[PDB]
Design a protein around this ligand. Structure first.
Ligand SMILES: [Ca+2]
Ligand SMILES: [Ca+2]
Ligand SMILES: [Ca+2]
Ligand SMILES: [Cl-]
Ligand code: NA
Ligand code: NA
Ligand code: NA
Lengths: 473, 4
């Protein structure tokens, strides 16, 4: 009979298990025999306290490097302000040691855990690329609780080396199955930021993870966008509990918070899932997340049922991760077919935006060709447009099955006159739909100002397959 | 940028 951890703070890890159902159903996975044995996770952040009493037993030098100082040792730089505590807090959520009388436990408390010290310095494209591409045949899962500024006016994504690292990772990493990149969707809620204006979260190669408060609400810091895939618990108001993990200087904290805590918990659940089936590809893992995540009792005003009967929200993606359901479904999972890509150049002429622009196009989704897609995964609207005040724009994309994705909500702080330069707005909300038929792009001025601009390019990029569909939910 |  499975025996749950005895660690002193495990009873405070409300998000891992409970009788209340407000949890990530992690104990069910543990009881099935999955605790992360043999899986390697790396925290790309400001370092990892490799000698921490709750990390040393799982620490993996092969999963670690110091890109900031160019040496193998990712130990954090100690300062009075304890600035470089962030990576250690993330690591303990994944893989804090269990049943050792110290602090709590990781989600995957028998996995191997490393860290890349890469945020404590100038974070160039090269720094990011050397981190994302570290030891890709040893590290299975990369967790990143960082990204572009959350000021609600930035549009920024991976530059060339970092994007090359993503493509190399998913193509040749993990023996050709593909590196698994887990991303925190952002902390820009108070600035009304959109996580589609962040090219790391908006990438198809990352599982972008949002947060829910203990009582099931959208936290103050949460960013809504269509690229988010799923949710894990994190902090909320001061009556709601927070995240328990390893802290700098060999301490234990019960007050880890924000978007930063959600991605590591997801990385831990994915590690348990990989233990259950080591042959899962990077795309298989996203399919499992889509099929098993749970909307129930997450509160949002934008829940919608997509074309295959799944509920989806811009705050939560497909809902809360469910570790027990993930590991169960992984065991007999049939590898998905190779990824197809169908490129549809929509416009025949530039279109003035004005107060409102609607572009309708009926597509065949590469009918009769080897890249014919009847089962969508990600879809992108790659848009090139000029506008005088970017944050006044709201952009929606409607699929042939009637699913309305918000590609961009208004951003009050985004005064930019620079527009969008082939920006690949991504939605997960039409996963498993048939993309044949009428797509609708809507661009509107949400303000009373007399704004102006022109849409000069709209490429609809469809990814997916032509086989293996399930009966809709 | 790149912020924690
Ligand atoms: Ca070092
Ligand atoms: Ca412990
Ligand atoms: Ca953001
Ligand atoms: Cl591609
Ligand atoms: Na491959
Ligand atoms: Na992503
Ligand atoms: Na159709």
């Amino acid at each position: 009979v499975y025996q749950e951890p005895t660690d002193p703070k495990f009873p405070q890890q409300w998000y891992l298990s409970g009788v209340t159902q407000r949890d990530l159903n992690v104990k069910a996975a543990w009881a099935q025999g999955y605790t992360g044995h043999g899986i390697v996770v790396s925290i790309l952040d400001d370092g990892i306290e490799k000698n921490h009493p709750d990390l040393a037993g799982n620490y993996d030098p092969g999963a670690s490097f110091d890109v900031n100082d160019q040496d193998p040792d990712p130990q954090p730089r100690y300062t009075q302000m304890n600035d470089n505590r962030h990576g250690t807090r993330c690591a303990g959520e994944v893989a804090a040691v269990a049943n050792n009388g110290v602090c709590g436990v990781g989600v995957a408390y028998n996995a191997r855990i490393g860290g890349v010290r890469m945020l404590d310095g100038e974070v160039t494209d090269a720094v990011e690329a050397r981190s994302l591409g570290l030891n890709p045949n040893h590290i299975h899962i990369y967790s990143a609780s960082w990204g572009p500024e959350d000021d609600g006016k930035t549009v920024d994504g991976p530059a060339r080396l970092a994007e090359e690292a993503f493509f190399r990772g998913v193509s040749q990493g993990r023996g050709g199955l593909g590196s698994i990149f887990v991303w925190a969707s952002g902390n820009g809620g108070r600035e009304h930021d959109s996580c589609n204006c962040d090219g790391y979260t908006n990438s198809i190669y990352t599982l972008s993870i949002s947060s829910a408060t203990q009582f099931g609400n959208v936290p103050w810091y949460s960013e809504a966008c269509s690229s988010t895939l799923a949710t894990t618990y994190s902090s909320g108001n001061q009556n709601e509990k927070q995240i328990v993990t390893t802290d700098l200087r060999q301490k234990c904290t019960e007050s880890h918070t924000g978007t930063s805590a959600s991605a590591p918990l997801a990385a831990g659940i994915i590690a348990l899932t990989l233990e259950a089936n080591k042959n899962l590809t990077w795309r298989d893992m996203q399919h499992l997340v889509v099929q098993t995540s749970k909307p129930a009792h997450l509160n949002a005003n934008d829940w919608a049922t997509n074309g295959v009967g799944r509920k989806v929200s811009h705050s939560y993606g497909y809902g809360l991760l469910d570790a027990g359901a993930m590991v169960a479904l992984a065991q007999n999972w049939t590898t998905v077919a190779p990824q197809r890509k169908c490129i549809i150049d929509i416009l025949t002429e530039p279109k003035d935006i004005g107060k409102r622009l609607e572009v309708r196009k009926t597509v065949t989704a590469c009918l009769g060709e080897p890249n014919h897609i009847t089962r969508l995964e990600h879809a992108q609207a790659r848009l090139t447009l000029s506008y005088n005040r970017r944050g006044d724009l709201a952009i929606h994309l409607v699929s042939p099955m009637g699913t309305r994705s918000t590609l961009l909500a208004a951003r009050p702080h985004d005064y930019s006159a620079d527009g969008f330069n082939d920006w690949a707005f991504m939605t997960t909300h039409s996963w498993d739909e048939d993309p044949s038929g009428e797509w609708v792009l809507e661009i509107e001025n949400t303000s009373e100002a007399n704004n102006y601009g022109t849409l000069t390019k709209f490429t609809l990029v469809l990814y997916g397959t032509a086989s293996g569909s399930l009966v809709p939910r | 940028x790149x912020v924690x």
